[PDB]
Design a protein around this ligand. Sequence first.
Ligand SMILES: [F-]
Ligand SMILES: [F-]
Ligand SMILES: [F-]
Ligand SMILES: [F-]
Lengths: 441, 444
Amino acid sequence: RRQLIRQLLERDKTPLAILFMAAVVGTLVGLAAVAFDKGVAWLQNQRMGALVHTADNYPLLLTVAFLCSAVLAMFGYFLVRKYAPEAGGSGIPEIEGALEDQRPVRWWRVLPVKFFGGLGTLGGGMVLGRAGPTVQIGGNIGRMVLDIFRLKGDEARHTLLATGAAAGLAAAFNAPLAGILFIIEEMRPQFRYTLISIKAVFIGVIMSTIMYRIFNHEVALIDVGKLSDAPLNTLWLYLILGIIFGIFGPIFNKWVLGMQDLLHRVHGGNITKWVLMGGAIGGLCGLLGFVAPATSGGGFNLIPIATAGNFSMGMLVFIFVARVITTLLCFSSGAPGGIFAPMLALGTVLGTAFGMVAVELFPQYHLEAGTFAIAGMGALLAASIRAPLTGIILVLEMTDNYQLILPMIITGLGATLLAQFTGGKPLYSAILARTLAKQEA
Amino acid sequence: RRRQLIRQLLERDKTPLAILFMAAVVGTLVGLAAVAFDKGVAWLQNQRMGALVHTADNYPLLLTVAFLCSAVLAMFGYFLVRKYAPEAGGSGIPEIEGALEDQRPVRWWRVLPVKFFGGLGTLGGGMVLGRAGPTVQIGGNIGRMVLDIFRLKGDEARHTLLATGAAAGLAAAFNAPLAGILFIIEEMRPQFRYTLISIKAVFIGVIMSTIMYRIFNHEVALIDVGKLSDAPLNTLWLYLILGIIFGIFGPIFNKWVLGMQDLLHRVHGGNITKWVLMGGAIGGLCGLLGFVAPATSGGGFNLIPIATAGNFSMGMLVFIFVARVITTLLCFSSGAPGGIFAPMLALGTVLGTAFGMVAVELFPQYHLEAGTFAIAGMGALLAASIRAPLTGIILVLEMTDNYQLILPMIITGLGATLLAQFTGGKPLYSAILARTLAKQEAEQ
Ligand SMILES: [F-]
Ligand SMILES: [F-]
Ligand SMILES: [F-]
Ligand SMILES: [F-]
């Protein structure tokens, strides 16, 4: 229908102003995200220097461990509850909401709350990720420049809010492709056509990523080395593993949803018990972060160690269980901060474990557990969040093990296929569902 | 629509188990078809090289069996297209794009044999054409056919199995799974309205397709380029400059192919016999060139590792670029079966290499390697002619494994699309589809 013929001849003509403004969004979200990340790090730092100041009296130092974190945690629970509730939890359900035009981007409130609130809960050493925070911060940045410059239209509101969020993923993980992919596979409205210019999201993601490289060059977030290739007669192991991730995904999805409810009892909704709960979780974490640091924190540190088979089978069973616990706690409590990255650490440990059984069950295959570690790494993403293409492309950008691309994709699909066949749902879709339903009811 | 949204969010990613199993089937068949296509094209280029040795003395006799061998295989492919499947002329990407708009018909009983055997002619003869088009149309048609055969009803199913055939078709062509999946969701899928295409199922298609390729292609890369040097932040501004160069060149290239499409239409007028004859003449020029200056002819994949590695003179790069622009325009604008996608990789590499060269001398403080610019230029003519930058970026990544080049690769790609937008240019597949949808009415 000729309408088409007119459309094909007018394809990819993004309004110059939407382009130039993406340049500024990415830049700002870039610096913001760098600053966030540098911030978080500095406080985990001080906490380490304070444990040295009191390095002798074991119960004293077990106390300043708890307290430095407990206090920082409360500052974050508080800052959210008092000024910006939409900035509790992840921030991706929220930004997805915004692109649907079913949630308000209150940038004058969320930027400072999420930034300094994230700073506390993360910097205190809680099991939460930078992924939600940075995407929320970035969409808000993008909304804020839309306002300030008074850009009018649907395309301008949707695009700038989108490039903002891709750039915030790009910057937090040094993952320009994964940034771009997360917008198209998860973030943009899933059930209707939208006017989100891709070339504009790209530009935003470049400037965001460059900013990261100005302040972070020479050191990568994960360094795993170059691992062995994967023989064709080995793949069916990767299928079995994605199946294991694909049954676990939904179960872990039930648990985050339920535990949200069961933590919502403890405080009833009340800013004083809610802040006091948060600093108990906060204290528990900063305490865990000294007596068994692998059960606490973001968990990036234990990834290269798991991938190189440097853990024993027991330690991995612990670390995994310990972390399912400290993940549900930290995230289902309402604290500002994601579940995304802490899934990276869970996916890795699960894999490495599976690889270890493969190595001893099939020595003819000449296996390396680190190759199951790397396929598992983003399998939880694929199985819970249900965004496999982004899960895969992200791990690719962080490990540089491209010869593993088939094992990674097979574990991915095996994950998303069993998640779907066991009634699980996209977690960030479930959360935005819960929030829209509790809204009109 | 808040209540419809809650209903919809909770019902997300629930692809009908039937469509998932079929994507598996489409994958596998496309994979095999792509491998068979790849091996068949290779066997003819090889026989042809066997004949040249059979006659390796008498130069004019050998310059003659060089011509006739291509000429015959060319005609045979032109003929099969004009006689049974006109839609299988050109690339086959505009076509499967049409089919995704429900504006073009997937006549798989006629296209599979025409595209396959007629591509085998034009590529195997040694013409300048890519595998991407052919294996994409082929793959989508295979998709259609398992749709018909199994009588799957749905709008989902038709678009899905049509999309997983195109994706499995690009994946198996380049050993590039990610590139295939991404080509669908950036370029192939209908651009101006919502659609019911399951990505999960396209994924399964792509997996199976790539596994088939690995069963019959293991241990030997399409492009080995080795690991190259990194790129420092103060190098970036140079890639942006290279993107811009591509960005103004992209559209200029696009006009020639459209133009050359017309000017060649005059030589035959529509006539199956001049067209076949002309095709066999073009063909014979290529098979001749393939012996007397091989880098000016054929797929291009051979001279990519060479260029990336600095082994060409600036005089050779300039020579190869111009002759190749010329022969790529001859072959694709003549409407033989075969795409323009892959030969744009080669053109791009060469152009970048050339730039890397001049960047190396002009700035020894930077410690450059021409090959980092060759690699950022590989998927750049893609960026500015075909305007699918996320695809050529992930494509090149998958084929050269040089991830540390990600920033310059992006940057150059973006630079290309922006200057391609800004100077009037359109997506090439979209402008070919359009000229065809418009012709659909022109004679009314
Ligand atoms: F996160
Ligand atoms: F999260
Ligand atoms: F091609
Ligand atoms: F093509």
